[PDB]
Design a protein around this ligand. Structure first.
Ligand SMILES: O=C(O)Cc1ccccc1Nc1c(Cl)cccc1Cl
Ligand SMILES: O=C(O)Cc1ccccc1Nc1c(Cl)cccc1Cl
Ligand SMILES: O=C(O)Cc1ccccc1Nc1c(Cl)cccc1Cl
Ligand SMILES: CCCCCCCCCCCCCCCC(=O)O
Ligand SMILES: CCCCCCCCCCCCCCCC(=O)O
Ligand SMILES: CCCCCCCCCCCCCCC(=O)O
Ligand SMILES: CCCCCCCCCCCCCCC(=O)O
Ligand SMILES: CCCCCCCCCCCCCCC(=O)O
Length: 581
C-alpha cells in the first residue's frame, strides 16, 4: 500500500469507487450543487487511475485523508458558503480531518425531498440512468452526513433494480410504489438505528454495549466457543466506537478487518458464512451482518450445572463478574434464537441481581438455587403480549387492528398530537402484519426489531415537543425497559375531555373520492378526535358509533346528491352520537 488511492480503487472497482467518492463529498460539502460534486469525483477518479497505473507517480503516496482534505480546501467558495469550515484548511492534517468531521451539519436546512410522479421517474431513469440515481444519492447523502456511506450505496443499487423492473411494467405505478415505500421506510429505520445505537453507547457505556453484543452474536453464531464470541464482542465494540465517531475511512477499515477475521475463521464461527465470505470487500461485512442464525448444536445441556448447582459459582463470579455474566448470557442466548435481545439482557440483569445478593448471604448455594424460576414470568411477558396481539390482528385485519390500537393508545396518553397518534397506530398495525405472519419462534425478535424503530421515532418526536412525563420517563430510561415501560402505561384517568367542535366532526363528499389510504387517515383522525372528546366511551359505545358512522358513509357515497346528504345525515349522525355518549 504505497498508494492508498490506488489500493482502494483496485478493491472497489471504478464504479463503486466513483459512487463512494460522491457520497463522501456530498456528506461534507452539503451545500454545493450536484454538478460541482461530479467534477470533483471525476478529478479524484482521474487522479486515482494515475496511481493504479503507477503507485509512484506524484502525490499517489499521499494518504486518503490528506487527498480528500486537499480537495475540500480547493473549493474556492468554501469560506463564503460554509464559513468556519474553511478555517479547517489552516490546520495541518490529523487536526484538519478532525475539524472537517466536526462541521458536518446533521439535519441542515434543506427542503423536503419530493417523490416525483411515476411517469417522470421512469422517464428520467430511462433517459439518463446514472445522473438520475446519483442525483438522488447526492440528495439523500447531503441530508444525512453521518449515514454509513456504503450502506447508502447499497440502497441506491436496490433503487436501481426497482426502476429497472418497474418502468417496463404494465401498471408501472402499482409495481414501483410499494417498492419505493419499502425502501424509504427501511432507510428511515437504518438511519435512526445508527443514531440510536451510538447514543446508547455514549449514555450507558461500553460494558452495557458489550453485553448487548454478546447476546446478539451468540444467537447468530451458536456453535462458536465463548472465547471466540468474546473476541468478536471486544472487536465489535471497538468498531462501533470508531464508526459512532464518524470518520468514514476508519469506520470502514475497522469493519473490513473484523469481517476478514470472521471469514478466516468460519469453521470456528458459523457454517452459514460461506457465501458472504466469498463477496468482495465492499459487501462482506454488510453481508455478514445480514446472515441467518446458524443452526444450534444438538446436545446442549441445561445451564443448571454451571450457573446454579455448581458450588464455586460465587467464586467463579467474583473472580471476573462481567466475564462470568458474559457466559450466562452467551449460553442462554445461543439456546434462544427466539428471544428478543432485550429479553435476554433482562435475564442477565436478573441473574446478576441475585448472585449479588446470594453470594453475600449466609448460604449462597441455597440462596441462589431456585433462580431460573424468576426467569419464567419475564419470558412469558413478551410472549403473551405477542400471542394476544397477533390473535387480535387475525380477527380484525390490519385496518381494524389499527383502529383498536388507536383507541387504546389515545386513552393512555390523550395529550399526543392527533396525527402522531394516527401515525404510530398505523405503523404499529403494520408491525402486526409483518411479524404475525411468522411462527412463534421468530415473532419476538421480529417485534423487537420493528418496535425499536417505531418506539424510537416516537421518542425523537416527543423530545422535540414533550407532552407527557410518563412518555419522557420511558424514552429516557433504560433502553432495555423502553418497550415494557410503554406496555405498562395506563389509561389517563386524569385527562380532561376535549371541547366539542363540529368542524372536527363535519364530513364532505370529497372523502368518497379519496383513496382507501387517505379515506382511512380521514376516518382514523376523526376516531382519535372522538376518543379525546369522549375518553370514557365504552368499547361497545365506540363500536356502535363507528358502525353508525361507517353506514352513514356508504349511504352518502352512493347517494344522488352526495353533499346535501353529508350535511343532513351528518347533523343527525352527530346529534345521535352526542346523545349515546
Ligand atoms: O425519507 C427520507 O427523508 C430519506 C429517504 C428517502 C428515500 C428513501 C429512503 C429514505 N430514508 C433514508 C434516510 Cl431518512 C436518510 C438517508 C437514506 C435513506 Cl434511504
Ligand atoms: O447488530 C449488530 O450491531 C452487529 C452484528 C449482529 C450480528 C452479527 C454480526 C454483527 N456485527 C458485525 C458487523 Cl455490523 C459488521 C462486521 C462484523 C460484525 Cl460481527
Ligand atoms: O443496558 C442498557 O440499559 C442499555 C440497552 C437497553 C436496551 C437495548 C440495548 C441496550 N444497550 C446498548 C448500549 Cl448500553 C449501547 C449501545 C447499544 C445498545 Cl443496544
Ligand atoms: C482521495 C479520495 C477521498 C475519499 C475516498 C472515499 C473512499 C471510500 C472508502 C469506503 C470503502 C467502503 C468499504 C466497505 C468495507 C466495509 O464496510 O466493511
Ligand atoms: C410523541 C410521542 C408519541 C407517543 C404515542 C403513544 C402511543 C403508545 C405506543 C405504545 C407502544 C407499546 C408497544 C407494546 C404494546 C402495548 O403494551 O400497548
Ligand atoms: C438512493 C437513490 C434513490 C433513487 C430514488 C429515490 C426517490 C426519492 C423519493 C423519496 C421518498 O420515497 O419519499
Ligand atoms: C407484534 C404486534 C404489533 C403490536 C405491538 C405490540 C407488541 C407487544 C409485544 C412486544 C414484545 C417485543 C419484544 C421486546 C421485549 O422483549 O420487550
Ligand atoms: C361527539 C360525537 C361526534 C360524532 C361523529 C362520529 C365520529 C366518527 C369517527 C369514526 C371513525 C370509525 C371508522 C370505522 C370505519 O372505517 O368503518
Amino acid at each position: 500500500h504505497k498508494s492508498e488511492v490506488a489500493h482502494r480503487f483496485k478493491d472497489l472497482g471504478e464504479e463503486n469507487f466513483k459512487a463512494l467518492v460522491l457520497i463522501a463529498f456530498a456528506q461534507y460539502l452539503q451545500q454545493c450543487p450536484f454538478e460541482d460534486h461530479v467534477k470533483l469525483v471525476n478529478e479524484v477518479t482521474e487522479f486515482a487511475k494515475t496511481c493504479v497505473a503507477d503507485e509512484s507517480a506524484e502525490n499517489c503516496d499521499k494518504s486518503l485523508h490528506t487527498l480528500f482534505g486537499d480537495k475540500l480546501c480547493t473549493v474556492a467558495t468554501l469560506r463564503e458558503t460554509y464559513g468556519e469550515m474553511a478555517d479547517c484548511c489552516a490546520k495541518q492534517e490529523p487536526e484538519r480531518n478532525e475539524c472537517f468531521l466536526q462541521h458536518k451539519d446533521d439535519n441542515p436546512n434543506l427542503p423536503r425531498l419530493v417523490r416525483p410522479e411515476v411517469d417522470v421517474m421512469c422517464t428520467a431513469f430511462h433517459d439518463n440512468e446514472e445522473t438520475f440515481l446519483k442525483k438522488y444519492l447526492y440528495e439523500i447523502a447531503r441530508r444525512h452526513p453521518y449515514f454509513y456511506a456504503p450502506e447508502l450505496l447499497f440502497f441506491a443499487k436496490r433503487y436501481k433494480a426497482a426502476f429497472t423492473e418497474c418502468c417496463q411494467a404494465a401498471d408501472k405505478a402499482a409495481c414501483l410504489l410499494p417498492k419505493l415505500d419499502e425502501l424509504r421506510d427501511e432507510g428511515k429505520a437504518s438511519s435512526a438505528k445508527q443514531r440510536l445505537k451510538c447514543a446508547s453507547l455514549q449514555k450507558f457505556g461500553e460494558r452495557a454495549f458489550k453485553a448487548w453484543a454478546v447476546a446478539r452474536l451468540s444467537q447468530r453464531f451458536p456453535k462458536a466457543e465463548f472465547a471466540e464470541v468474546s473476541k468478536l464482542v471486544t472487536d465489535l465494540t471497538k468498531v462501533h466506537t470508531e464508526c459512532c465517531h464518524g470518520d468514514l475511512l476508519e469506520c470502514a477499515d475497522d469493519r473490513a478487518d473484523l469481517a476478514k477475521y470472521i471469514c478466516e475463521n468460519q469453521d470456528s464461527i458459523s457454517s452459514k458464512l460461506k457465501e458472504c465470505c466469498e463477496k468482495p470487500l465492499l459487501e462482506k461485512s454488510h453481508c455478514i451482518a445480514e446472515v441467518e442464525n446458524d443452526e444450534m448444536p444438538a446436545d446442549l445441556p441445561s445451564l443448571a450445572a454451571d450457573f446454579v448447582e455448581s458450588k464455586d459459582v460465587c467464586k467463579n463470579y467474583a473472580e471476573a463478574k462481567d466475564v462470568f455474566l458474559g457466559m450466562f448470557l452467551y449460553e442462554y442466548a445461543r439456546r434462544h434464537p427466539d428471544y428478543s435481545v432485550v429479553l435476554l439482557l433482562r435475564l442477565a440483569k436478573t441473574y446478576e441481581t441475585t448472585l449479588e445478593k446470594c453470594c453475600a448471604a449466609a448460604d449462597p448455594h441455597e440462596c441462589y438455587a431456585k433462580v431460573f424460576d424468576e426467569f419464567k414470568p419475564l419470558v412469558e411477558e413478551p410472549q403473551n403480549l405477542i400471542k394476544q396481539n397477533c390473535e387480535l390482528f387475525e380477527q380484525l385485519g390490519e385496518y381494524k387492528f389499527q383502529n383498536a390500537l388507536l383507541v387504546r393508545y389515545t386513552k393512555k396518553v390523550p395529550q399526543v398530537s392527533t396525527p402522531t397518534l394516527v401515525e404510530v397506530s398505523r405503523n404499529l398495525g403494520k408491525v402486526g402484519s409483518k411479524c404475525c405472519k411468522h411462527p412463534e419462534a421468530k415473532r419476538m425478535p421480529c417485534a423487537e426489531d420493528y418496535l425499536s424503530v417505531v418506539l424510537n421515532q416516537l421518542c425523537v418526536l416527543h423530545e422535540k415537543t414533550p407532552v407527557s412525563d410518563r412518555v419522557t420517563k420511558c424514552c429516557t430510561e433504560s433502553l432495555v425497559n423502553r418497550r415494557p415501560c410503554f406496555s405498562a402505561l395506563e389509561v389517563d384517568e386524569t385527562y380532561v375531555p376535549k371541547e366539542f367542535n363540529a368542524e372536527t366532526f363535519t364530513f364532505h363528499a370529497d372523502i368518497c373520492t379519496l383513496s382507501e389510504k387517505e379515506r382511512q387517515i380521514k376516518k382514523q383522525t376523526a376516531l382519535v378526535e372522538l376518543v379525546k372528546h369522549k375518553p370514557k366511551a365504552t368499547k361497545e359505545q365506540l363500536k356502535a358509533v363507528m358502525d353508525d358512522f361507517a353506514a352513514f358513509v356508504e349511504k352518502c357515497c352512493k347517494a344522488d346528491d352526495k353533499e346535501t346528504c353529508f350535511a343532513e345525515e351528518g347533523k343527525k349522525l352527530v346529534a345521535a352520537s352526542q346523545a349515546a355518549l
